[PDB]
Amino acid sequence: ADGVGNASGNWHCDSQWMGNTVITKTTRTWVLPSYNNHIYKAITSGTSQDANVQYAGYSTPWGYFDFNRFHCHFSPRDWQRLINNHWGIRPKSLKFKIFNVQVKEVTTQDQTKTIANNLTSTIQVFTDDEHQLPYVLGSATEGTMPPFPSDVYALPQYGYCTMHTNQNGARFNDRSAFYCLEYFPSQMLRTGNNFEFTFDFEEVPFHSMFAHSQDLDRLMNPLVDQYLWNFNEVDSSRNAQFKKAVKGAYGTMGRNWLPGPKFLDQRVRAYTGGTDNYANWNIWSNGNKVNLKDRQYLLQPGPVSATYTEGEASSLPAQNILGIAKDPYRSGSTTAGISDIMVTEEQEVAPTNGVGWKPYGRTVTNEQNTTTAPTSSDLDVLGALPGMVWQNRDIYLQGPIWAKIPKTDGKFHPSPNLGGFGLHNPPPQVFIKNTPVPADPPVEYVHQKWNSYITQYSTGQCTVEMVWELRKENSKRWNPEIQFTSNFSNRTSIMFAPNETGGYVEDRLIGTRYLTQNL
Amino acid sequence: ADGVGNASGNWHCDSQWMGNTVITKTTRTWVLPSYNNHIYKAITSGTSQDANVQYAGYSTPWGYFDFNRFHCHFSPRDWQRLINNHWGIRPKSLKFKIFNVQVKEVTTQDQTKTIANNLTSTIQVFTDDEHQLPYVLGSATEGTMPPFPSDVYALPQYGYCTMHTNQNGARFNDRSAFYCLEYFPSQMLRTGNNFEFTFDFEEVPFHSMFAHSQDLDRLMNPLVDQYLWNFNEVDSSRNAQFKKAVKGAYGTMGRNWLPGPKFLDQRVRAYTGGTDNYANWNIWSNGNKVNLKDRQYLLQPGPVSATYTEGEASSLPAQNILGIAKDPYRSGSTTAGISDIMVTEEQEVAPTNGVGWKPYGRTVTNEQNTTTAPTSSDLDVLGALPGMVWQNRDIYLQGPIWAKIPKTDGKFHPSPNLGGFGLHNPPPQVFIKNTPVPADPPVEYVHQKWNSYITQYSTGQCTVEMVWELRKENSKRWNPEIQFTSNFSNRTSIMFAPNETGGYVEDRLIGTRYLTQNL
Amino acid sequence: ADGVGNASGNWHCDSQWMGNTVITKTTRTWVLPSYNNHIYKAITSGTSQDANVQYAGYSTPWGYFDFNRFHCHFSPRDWQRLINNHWGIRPKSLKFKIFNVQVKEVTTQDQTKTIANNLTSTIQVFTDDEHQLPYVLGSATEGTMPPFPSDVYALPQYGYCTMHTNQNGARFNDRSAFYCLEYFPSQMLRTGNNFEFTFDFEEVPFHSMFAHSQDLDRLMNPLVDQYLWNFNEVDSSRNAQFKKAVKGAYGTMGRNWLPGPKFLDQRVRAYTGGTDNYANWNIWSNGNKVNLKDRQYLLQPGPVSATYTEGEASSLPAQNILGIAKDPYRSGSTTAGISDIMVTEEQEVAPTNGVGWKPYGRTVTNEQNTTTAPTSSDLDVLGALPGMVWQNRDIYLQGPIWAKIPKTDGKFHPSPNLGGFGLHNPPPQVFIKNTPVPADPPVEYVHQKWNSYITQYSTGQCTVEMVWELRKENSKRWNPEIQFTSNFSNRTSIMFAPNETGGYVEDRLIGTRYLTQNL
């Protein structure tokens, strides 16, 4: 294909806007180590007796590419052009390349590393097109490409969980599956070789890049009464009374449509002002949980809900938020306060979704009679009922693009709770390993497992080219709308740029919902 | 197009039944005033501090046509032919005309009005085809065409609500949208000119014009046992016992299908007999409510439920009913009793839907053991679960035809709670205004807003032509069925006709569900 | 394209003279380090509180090529053929190549550097054709190619200034723009690869390579009187008197044309003889300045003016000169005297431009009457008035070729003050970087920014080929003209050649204006 002295690819980063489509291209330099030192390891939770944290699986010698966050594909300026001018976006097609491969050997002598080119060494690359391997993308995990184009990123090690059991610690059972990645055809690359593949997204709904400019309970003409007559009260004579729904009677009016279903969330005050928190409680005791088998885990974030009520504006739904550290590299060994963490604000869905820590509503709790007074209480948690409408969670420049829909007999509204595009056929996983280069063999043959290798690592460039379909904003609104703008003011470095020491700084989460549209 | 002395259209009222389709045509005389005196007004709830009743929006100089009730398009006799002979109906296409336009000027001198033709004055008409304006149809509000063909109807004024906030009264915010209707292309009509447009409905499910002749729990052959063995009890020895489901064991039988999901409603006795009401309580305190943002409002009517259990036949689900005044013009300033109000009766859905004030069922509340006895309670409110089946609300001659489905990421069974056809693309709103005719200008130019106008109003005729698709009744039932008939007996005027003073009288609600069909 | 063992280009240095065009070709060896160690740095003036020196911007990992001085493209002998034989020159087209690329790695062990070829490493090259990056060429800054063909030149690091504000030091604001150069498509080159592009200059005026042989006030025939009669005086009787402009009356004659507009400059005596200087004053206090925002800066050099009056021949306009060190590498840490600095002499423009420290002329300062005597003073600074004509600044073998015209709504005579060709579309900037080669990655994946790299640098050859359009000298002058010649006499090394230690010596500035032409 190509020799030692020719480049096998070129650098491509741009965004192209044509018609109803935008094409993003981005190139990175990647680094791949040799993981596990060329073996598979059965990994578990060990002696841990807590069923909730138990797991069983395998770490592999293979690495992988994760481009599943938007800021991989969009500059902040391009994200601005997207969210200010368009009502919708969905992924269409994908092209991925690996080129300019460099395999290197590391030799240590007397605490002295020397790095040299190994020109005859290979890397192996394959994509899993039929989704025959455990799919670890779409879990919102690190190891994604860094947003900034000149940043290098080490490829994460591939591993997976498989079925486990609880007896005196995690154990594999008969349903536990092992996957050898060397049991798949992969092409081998020396420095001259390159790799590419293409992918087409299935048809999915456009993400809704707008906020509603109307509330689900305001849909009627304010100037006219309804012709409906609703039950009002029972008179002292015990006879039922009916009241006409009249203009301004909004509490009593009959409606065709209901807010979407929700869990109840606990409210926390994350910002200055408003109703203050109770002290010394953790979400693990008091939060929403999911029972699965013998295990519990916190239900986070669940379907999206409105973030706050006005006047309570500093409060958050505890578990309904996506937190992201302002410093991507901040260590998770210690907790952080609100000042260190970017938290998503879902207020755009307030017209249809209801606020997280508000109950869905009230429910009648009894059947009344002459001697039984009517009673009612809160409806905290409610499933789907005919007439409900809701918005999905917003997508963020720093958030995940897609998630793989689990393969199941049934689903309800398969929109991922973390946000993004639910896909029956997500983009295939791209696996990469350094081909093992054995060390010096013994002169006299011995029967043993081969543990001796030359230390290798590889580096190169990768281009990701995505095509995005757009819905144009079409609106007769007379007055100006809300736009995302730079209101950062005076700074010691440019926002969404490198700082003095070269660290890339994105301290603000950016959603898509700025333009408005009627219900 | 046409002069002063030629009619621009003819009167058309008929119903045509051909094959699987019925075509309704109806003509009315309309009256349009000049609303707001040619200005837009920002309208709010004012100083009201109650968040529940707050709103913000605009009243417009424009009027509009609302034909969204069935009795606009169907005579009572045609409605009878529909409901006795057919299993289903859905709208197909729509044609609307405005013609024979007459613009008139009103001059008042010394408390004396004179009305004269203004031959050079215009009206403006446009339809909003792309649904770019706030859609106020489908809220079951007055200003619809009157059922009776020779009744004149004044066109209602168009207004809308837009996003508001709660601080010290209702306020507009940055998401609040203003819409100038003069920012749309509209054709202008003098007395010779006419207007028309056509519309096609999207494919929607046929309304179910039948009642089920079977109950969801009776579906099996009564002559045969099941081969299923269900858990029955635990013996005094603590061992589980299994009982065979045998013919007649209907309470214990395994089934494939579940009744539809429901809210629990409070029961009220609206008629003579049965269990009497508790005294002096109102639905606002005790009823089902919806939390939306910081607001509450009564959940009415919600998905349809069965109206009563037999022997309780006089009771109603409080909030699950559509009330309609027997006198359409009865003032809403005072409450009414059952004798003044027509209330819908949903008993046809009793086979699948369950009764409004009955809980869905019972639920086990605990995990038993040797020292823990099993407990259970009522399941009042339940969302959708696999295996549920239900009926939608019935449509009525006096009820709404369609509702606009809110534009949202997700929906569950988008059938409108008030009944009718949920539409992603409903029929477009038809807006009409009297073109402002300015009064005498000042001889010397002055810089000021122009407030001086000649008083105008317009009148004309409008034809609505709808095409309806039908499903023919196909049944092997041997015995006669239920039919809608005239059983009114002796009256001082014909029912569904004018009375002595010319008022049109429809005192009986008429559903579609008479014919029966098996589950 | 090419392997390890083949050259990807050849050495080209020549000048071709054909017809009205000259083609210059020149080749250099370049060296590129890795700047900033593969990061962008936000750079400011720091804690400096002086608004005049404040700045904000970015240094980039990229380098660039600057060939924007004439002695890059012309040997002294070719410059001689140009200026002695031609009246005009302008750039036409440009071709640039990068070839014979060598990427090398530096390894330090125990204070011992070893340099080795890295055969699989790349460089990245792109040109900014649409001028989408801050354009730093045309500011007369170092980092240009050295004149002498066998000299190697390190490529300068690319950086730029962006909008800043003054508050407690320089700050970035919302108008400050960051530019990632990796957000541009660039081709990647191994040792076999090469690069080229072509460019066409827009039509610009020929530089005027001649001096005028007439003065703007001598244009008339000396043998004939004018027929004009000019106001002369007012007699003791108060009546106005008119005097005929007669041959020899040059001070009183009417003329069609005016000298060009000018700032007033301060005169300094830079050479022996003439009127001596005042002592102990600096130009920062006493010089011409420009107010821009809250900042001041010295107005240098401004539009060109004549350098001196005869008899004052040792004086200079203080700020109107281009100084260039006779030693290009003399450090700027200390001031230099005239003997160390080559200073341009603009005397060729004396016919039309007026001398820098002379005022433009005299102006009447009052409106006289019987009791008010006429007064007048100096006109120091004057803008453009109808009838003015002027010459631009001369171009020098050691001076800049072009400058980018700022993109603005309006311009007056967009000829650069430093001299050369003002261009709306200047030659594109050529950016080059060493592709980062990552070092050994950690075996166990960690989430951190990648700071580990192998030290790289690159070298190669670059050819610049420019096409120049010429205007031929056409003159009927009988007597010989002024020519540029070698009058250096006896030297220890050849002038415009290397010295004993190999340093290239050009101690004399050479303008283009030798041939003469009438006004």
Question: What method was applied to determine this entry?
Answer: cryo-EM
Token pair recorded at residue A41: 């390891």
For CA atoms C181, C184, C189, C193, give the dihedral sign. Answer: negative
- List phi, psi (to 5°) of B472: -75, 140
Check B281 against A374: CB less than 8 A apart: yes
**What amino acid is encoded at C501 in this protein?**
T
Among A4, A27, A485, whose Cβ lies nearest the Cβ of C120?
Answer: A4
Contact A229, B334 (CB under 8 A): no
Q: Give the nearest chain C residue to A38 (CA atoms).
A: C443
Q: Write down the number of H helices and E strands in chain C.
A: 4, 34
DSSP structural state of residue A80: H
Distance CA B401, CA B387 (A): 29
Check A490 against C442: CB less than 8 A apart: no
3-class secondary structure for C155-200? CCEEEEEECEECCCCCEECCCCCCCCHHHCCEEEECCCCCEEEEEE
Check A4 against C119: CB less than 8 A apart: yes
Token pair recorded at residue B476: 């092997």
In sequence order, the β-bridge partners of residue A400 are A69
Contact A327, A339 (CB under 8 A): no
CA B329-B333-B335 angle, to 5 degrees, is 90
Among B362, B390, B372, CA closest to B519: B390
Reported resolution in A? Answer: 2.4
Beta carbons within 8 Å of B123's beta carbon, 6+ residues apart: B32, B101, B103, B188, B189, B432, B433, B434, B435, B458
C154 min Cα distance to partner chain A (Å): 23
Check B161 against A215: CB less than 8 A apart: yes
Among C42, C120, C449, whose Cβ lies nearest the Cβ of A329?
Answer: C449
Among B396, B395, B394, B392, CA closest to B414: B392
Among C42, C176, C189, whose Cβ lies nearest the Cβ of A7?
Answer: C189
Q: Which residues of A touch B289 (CB under 8 A)?
A: 361-362
Among A37, A329, A491, whose Cβ lies nearest the Cβ of C171?
Answer: A491
| Buried/exposed code over A108-137 (b: 16+ C-beta within 10 A; e: otherwise) | eeeeeeebebbeebbbbbbbbeeeebbbbb
Q: Is B114 exposed, middle or buried, given 0-12, 13-18 or 19+ CB atoms closer than 10 A?
A: exposed
Count of alpha carbons within 13 Å of A494, Cβ hemisphere only? 25
Distance CA A306, CA A260 (A): 11
C105 min Cα distance to partner chain A (Å): 10
Count of alpha carbons within 13 Å of B252, Cβ hemisphere only? 17
| Buried/exposed code over A430-445 (b: 16+ C-beta within 10 A; e: otherwise) | bbbbbbbbeeeeeeee
| C-beta neighbour count of A338 within 10 angstroms | 15
Token pair recorded at residue A79: 């994200």
E strand intervals along C288-374: 289-292, 295-298, 315-317, 323-325, 341-343, 361-364
Among C1, C174, C187, whose Cβ lies nearest the Cβ of A10?
Answer: C187
Contact A250, A242 (CB under 8 A): no
Breaks (C-N over 2.5 A) in chain A follow: none
Q: Which residues of C touch A119 (CB under 8 A)?
A: 119-120
Top residue of A35, A490, A496 to mutate, by most chain C CBs within 10 Å, is A490
Contact partners of C by the rule of 3+ C-beta pairs under 8 A? A
User: Which run of H or E residues covers position B54?
Assistant: none
Distance CA C203, CA C91 (A): 9
Distance CA C510, CA C484 (A): 8
Top residue of C60, C106, C447 to mutate, by most chain A CBs within 10 Å, is C447
Check C173 against A489: CB less than 8 A apart: yes
Among B323, B328, B381, whose Cβ lies nearest the Cβ of A242?
Answer: B323
Check A374 against B288: CB less than 8 A apart: no
Question: Which residue do the tokens 């390190």 mark?
Answer: C154
DSSP structural state of residue A51: G
- CA C40 from chain centre, in angstroms, equals 28
Contact partners of B by the rule of 3+ C-beta pairs under 8 A? A
Distance CA A500, CA A342 (A): 22
Distance CA A91, CA A72 (A): 14
Through-space distance between the first and last CA atoms of chain A, rounded to whole angstroms: 57
Residues in chain C: 519
Q: Which residues of B touch A232 (CB under 8 A)?
A: 282-284, 335
Distance CA B408, CA B350 (A): 31
Residue B172's SS3 state is strand
Contact A210, A195 (CB under 8 A): no
3-class secondary structure for A317-373? ECCCCCEEECCCCCCCCCCCCHHHEEECCCHHHHHHHCECCCCCEEEECCCCECCEC
DSSP structural state of residue B139: S
Among A29, A33, A119, whose Cβ lies nearest the Cβ of C442?
Answer: A33
Among B418, B515, B440, CA closest to B474: B515
For CA atoms B222, B226, B232, B236, give the dihedral sign. Answer: positive
Distance CA B493, CA A305 (A): 56
One-character DSSP codes across C440-455: PPPSS---S----B-E
Breaks (C-N over 2.5 A) in chain C follow: none
Q: Which residues of A touch B322 (CB under 8 A)?
A: 228, 254
Contact partners of A by the rule of 3+ C-beta pairs under 8 A? B, C
Token pair recorded at residue C357: 């420290």
Q: Is B253 exposed, middle or buried, given 0-12, 13-18 or 19+ CB atoms closer than 10 A?
A: middle
A260 min Cα distance to partner chain B (Å): 8
Check B319 against A231: CB less than 8 A apart: yes
Token pair recorded at residue A508: 């603000």
User: Cis bond leading into C259, ω under 30°?
Assistant: no
Among C338, C351, C360, C269, CA closest to C306: C351
DSSP structural state of residue C222: T
Among A347, A359, A354, CA closest to A314: A347
Q: Give the nearest chain C residue to A486 (CA atoms).
A: C174
- List phi, psi (to 5°) of B15: -130, 135
Contact B201, B423 (CB under 8 A): yes
Token pair recorded at residue B399: 């009820």
Radius of gyration of chain A (CA): 28
Angstrom CA distances, A194 to A1, A101, A473, C190, stand at 8, 7, 41, 15
- CA C430 from chain centre, in angstroms, equals 19
- CA A132 from chain centre, in angstroms, equals 22
A347 min Cα distance to partner chain B (Å): 10
Question: Which residue do the tokens 């809300």 mark?
Answer: A482
Is chain A adjacent to chain C, meaning 3+ CB pairs within 8 angstroms? yes
Among C273, C232, C233, C268, CA closest to C249: C232
